[PDB]
Design an enzyme around this catalytic site. Structure first.
Site, mmCIF file in Angstrom:
data_model
loop_
_atom_site.group_PDB
_atom_site.id
_atom_site.type_symbol
_atom_site.label_atom_id
_atom_site.label_comp_id
_atom_site.label_asym_id
_atom_site.label_seq_id
_atom_site.Cartn_x
_atom_site.Cartn_y
_atom_site.Cartn_z
ATOM 1 N N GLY A 268 0.798 -1.203 0.000
ATOM 2 C CA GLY A 268 0.000 0.000 0.000
ATOM 3 C C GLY A 268 0.834 1.257 0.000
ATOM 4 N N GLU A 293 -1.306 -1.553 -6.681
ATOM 5 C CA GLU A 293 -1.813 -0.344 -7.322
ATOM 6 C C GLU A 293 -0.674 0.527 -7.793
ATOM 7 O OE2 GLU A 293 -5.339 1.152 -4.714
#
Ligand SMILES: *SCCNC(=O)CCNC(=O)[C@H](O)C(C)(C)COP(=O)(O)OP(=O)(O)OC[C@H]1O[C@@H](n2cnc3c(N)ncnc32)[C@H](O)[C@@H]1OP(=O)(O)O
Ligand SMILES: CC(C)(COP(=O)(O)OP(=O)(O)OC[C@H]1O[C@@H](n2cnc3c(N)ncnc32)[C@H](O)[C@@H]1OP(=O)(O)O)[C@@H](O)C(=O)NCCC(=O)NCCS
Ligand SMILES: [Cl-]
Ligand SMILES: [Cl-]
Ligand SMILES: [Cl-]
Ligand SMILES: [Cl-]
EC number: 2.8.3.18
Lengths: 504, 513
Positions: A268, A293
């Site tokens: 993250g 991501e």
């Protein structure tokens, strides 16, 4: 050389100021931009100046701003200063915009990042008047090459009535080729297509965003930089956290609950992450694969060391040093990185299929292992849920990491009850602080509490938590998830009232 | 004729009591059973008896019981009465078991239903000692035909050291063929398989559960009915909720945001559902499709009428008169229904791809539209999250429906802050009570609150709610999601202390002025 390789589209080049005039009060504007990478820069500045002018003349002038995720000073910053954003989604990290949000001056909703494209197609944000997208280049056949992130750009291009492209010479030309844009139906009208990704390294699309040249109302040549992550290094608290997690992974491999190469990794946003990645850089797990991501310094390092073979993401998040490193060796790294649309990188179907290990930060957790990722004291927005929900719920293993205290020990990151919940008990199996690691798999809430308190809580706060839990067990309305509602949120109110959660 | 069509396995047939003896203190036991359908009946009864006997003599005897979802009196009921369950997962509706859980006598964790199989394979519940599964029949090649639900039965069969089968002659033989069991890797070791479902009526597997016959330690012949709990006829509150929902659907179609046939429908467990389903059968929407966790009375009706073309689920959830109807026509209903493994019915990949509309009940929501589906006052378990999270988060549209008050008006279903959260704001777009419908799409929390308070809250409580909200806006630490932490949970505490959320006029309350 020349970045606009389609000759006919050169006739559309104009000033940022002129272009900004295409954006009307009330417009819904979709932009590129994700983790401080690849957002439009010049048009927003000019829009901002014109907004303040209009306001001074008593002219209403605001927009709705939908992005990939976070942007930067040129975008969120400038528009915030001008008081020109009435609504913002889905993720912000700019201080001025954050202040607008927390003052109630800009409306904000932090959607799951992997869902934004779909909700935009459904029409949840209204009709998209404008797509403002930053490009490295425009191919001869009129393809739009994205910059340092894909985000939602393909979707915004599809949806918007008018398209403004900023072509930024600052961005490295050798980005061309790194992206994978799929022409499939991921976020469109159901029934959607199956996304045929079965390996993190698999490309299923092409290198350019597609748009109808008739919609392009302006192209603006620009030259300006993305934001960089801070260079700073992980402290002793982060290192301890990384150490506990690496030991955990080690024990899982020995028990045959993980393969020696682990599983695709999602790391993250945050500094605790870099500690973990640095740990993995020199760790005993080889042939790692990232399905995340974002590409941060830590992952870049692991691709460097060869400890990680490939990494999939929607965006970059790099220190200036890391940026320089990659811009010198783009040809090397380019063969090891795949940048995808965020509705693909954050697809729950794909995440679960690949069996990702999700490692995310947190504001706080309560003793039962509910997690707050966003709202301090329950009401003050930090950044947003981002993709932490996309990954936490879909992952093979969901892991949250944090210092056991914040604000110099004046706040406990483990509390009786979270002031706001982003991730429910079911979405969190493992907690790690510098105090230790709690493995909650298969446990009831009362059992989760015993583990979290004994393993993760700071010694300063552990006795207070044990006091709360013991009396809850004795006096709670129900005994399944014992609480004392008169004091559940009392530590937060104490911080508000006195500046510390420690009683006087 | 014979329900056991495989000759070799017939020698394993034995009495329930004897089969029960295979289950030992401390065992992890996985069973069939989902929303009162298809759970084992005789072996658990016998087991409960023996547990009570042991207990009476100061001998320990408890199991960990992992199911598909909720079971029935013969299983959850009998075992809870005997105090024979040390750990339970993932979903229960039995009142005695609920009491054990809420007294701290049985440890409980309500996992997302679509995830249970994968967590079991991962080892989260430990090593499975016993799989106990109800069957309609056993085929010539030793396939196990399931009954009124599929649940997690295939996974439990794969995992368990020993297997016990109850062959239930009460269950219509024509259930054979209604099930779809996939040999694909849905909940096993990554990388998992693509689950190639691209339509709600699509079968990807076969009609039988598969198990190594060498693991089958006992087979029990039974004849006993499922827990066909009573039909709760919709009241005026339920009908009003359904009316507002149907008006909404009509509007979305008129605005071209839904096809006239809507999209695949998931209808949660509860009493508001019958109103919605009844509304839909009278409604203007044709060619409906169900892709749900359960099939309830209302769905059977539309299948019979042709209003609904196909219904996919993991289980039945029928009233006795509903089991009756389907039993007399299983021949007909078998062609309109597909029963799937719950890790497929509740697969987030599939639910999103098909674009399901999710409609679920709730305990309460706060003014910002965070949803509690499980824990009263935040600490007392009702049923469990079930598949509401599976569906809410993955759906094309997520809708929550509830009476605006509970306990005869003494509780407001709209509160300043939920005492527990199951579904975050991001997972809930539409709220419906008998007061109206709140459409929250594209709204910030403060905007959500203005809609929820004005459209959904009961008039008896709205002034109090507005008072909280107004003062929070003025005083809250941050103004993004305004709260007064001193008051946030005070209505729940007022209920605990006085049995009502309503304030006593003998004291001041800012909304009283
Ligand atoms: S892409 C998929 C994952 N996406 C996400 O998880 C999105 C949401 N997560 C985040 O925004 C961050 O992960 C958060 C939760 C903010 C944590 O970031 P860090 O890992 O970097 O942790 P830090 O210790 O560095 O904290 C950063 C700031 O947050 C404040 N903070 C943390 N914890 C608390 C508590 N319990 N109470 C108050 N504040 C807290 C820190 O103070 C710090 O802010 P400063 O302004 O620098 O003090
Ligand atoms: C939340 C849930 C219990 C509501 O059920 P429902 O039939 O729609 O609503 P009802 O108004 O009839 O109330 C059901 C029970 O909850 C209680 N209840 C509901 N709201 C309450 C509240 N705000 N405070 C206290 N109790 C409440 C009712 O009193 C009733 O309890 P009782 O049996 O002791 O009398 C139910 O939907 C559920 O358990 N959901 C979880 C599983 C799920 O959603 N799965 C989805 C896929 S199938
Ligand atoms: Cl897919
Ligand atoms: Cl678990
Ligand atoms: Cl799939
Ligand atoms: Cl939305």
């Amino acid at each position: 050389t020349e970045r606009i390789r389609n000759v006919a589209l050169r006739s559309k080049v104009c000033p940022a100021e002129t272009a900004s005039e295409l954006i009307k009060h009330g417009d819904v504007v979709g932009t590129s931009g994700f983790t401080g990478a690849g957002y439009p820069k010049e048009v927003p500045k000019a829009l901002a100046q014109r907004m303040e002018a209009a306001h001074d003349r008593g002219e209403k002038y605001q927009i709705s701003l939908i992005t990939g995720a976070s942007t930067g000073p040129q975008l969120d910053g400038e528009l915030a200063k001008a008081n020109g954003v009435y609504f913002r989604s889905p993720f912000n990290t700019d201080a001025t915009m954050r202040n607008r949000i927390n003052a109630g001056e800009t409306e904000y909703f932090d959607n799951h990042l992997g869902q934004v494209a779909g909700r935009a197609v459904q029409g949840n944000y209204g009709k998209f008047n404008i797509a403002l997208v930053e490009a490295t280049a425009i191919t001869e056949d009129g393809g739009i090459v994205p910059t340092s992130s894909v985000g939602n750009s393909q979707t915004f291009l599809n949806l918007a009535e008018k398209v403004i492209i900023e072509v930024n010479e600052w961005q490295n030309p050798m980005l061309e080729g790194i992206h994978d844009i799929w022409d499939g139906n991921v976020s469109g009208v159901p029934t959607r297509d199956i996304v045929p990704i079965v390996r993190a390294d698999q490309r299923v699309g092409g290198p350019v965003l597609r748009v109808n040249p008739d919609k392009i109302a302006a192209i603006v040549r620009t030259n300006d930089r993305d934001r960089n992550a801070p260079f700073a290094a992980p402290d002793e608290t982060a290192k301890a956290i990384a150490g506990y997690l690496l030991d955990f992974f080690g024990h899982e491999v020995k028990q045959n609950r993980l393969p020696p190469s682990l599983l695709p990794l999602q790391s993250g946003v945050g500094n605790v992450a870099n500690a973990v990645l640095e740990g993995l850089k020199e760790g005993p797990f080889e042939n790692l694969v990232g399905y995340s991501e974002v590409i941060q310094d830590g992952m870049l390092a692991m691709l460097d060391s060869g400890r990680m073979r490939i990494a999939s993401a929607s965006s970059f998040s790099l220190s200036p040093e890391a940026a320089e490193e990659i811009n010198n060796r783009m040809d090397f790294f380019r063969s090891k990185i795949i940048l995808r649309q965020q509705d693909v990188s954050n697809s729950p179907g794909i995440i679960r299929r690949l069996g990702c290990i999700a490692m995310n930060g947190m504001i706080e957790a309560d003793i039962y292992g509910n997690v707050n990722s966003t709202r301090v004291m329950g009401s003050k927005m930090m950044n947003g849920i981002g993709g932490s929900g996309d990954f936490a719920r879909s992952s093979y293993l969901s892991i949250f990491l944090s210092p056991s205290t914040a604000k110099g020990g004046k706040i406990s990151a483990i509390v009786p009850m979270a002031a706001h919940v982003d991730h429910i008990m079911q979405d969190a199996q493992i907690f790690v602080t510098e105090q230790g690691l709690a493995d909650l798999r298969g446990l009831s809430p009362v059992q989760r509490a015993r583990e979290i308190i004994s393993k993760c809580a700071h010694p300063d706060y552990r006795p207070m938590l044990q006091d709360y839990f013991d009396r809850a067990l004795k006096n709670s309305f129900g005994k399944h998830t014992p609480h004392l509602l008169t004091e559940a949120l009392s530590w937060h109110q104490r911080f508000i009232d006195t500046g510390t959660m420690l009683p006087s």
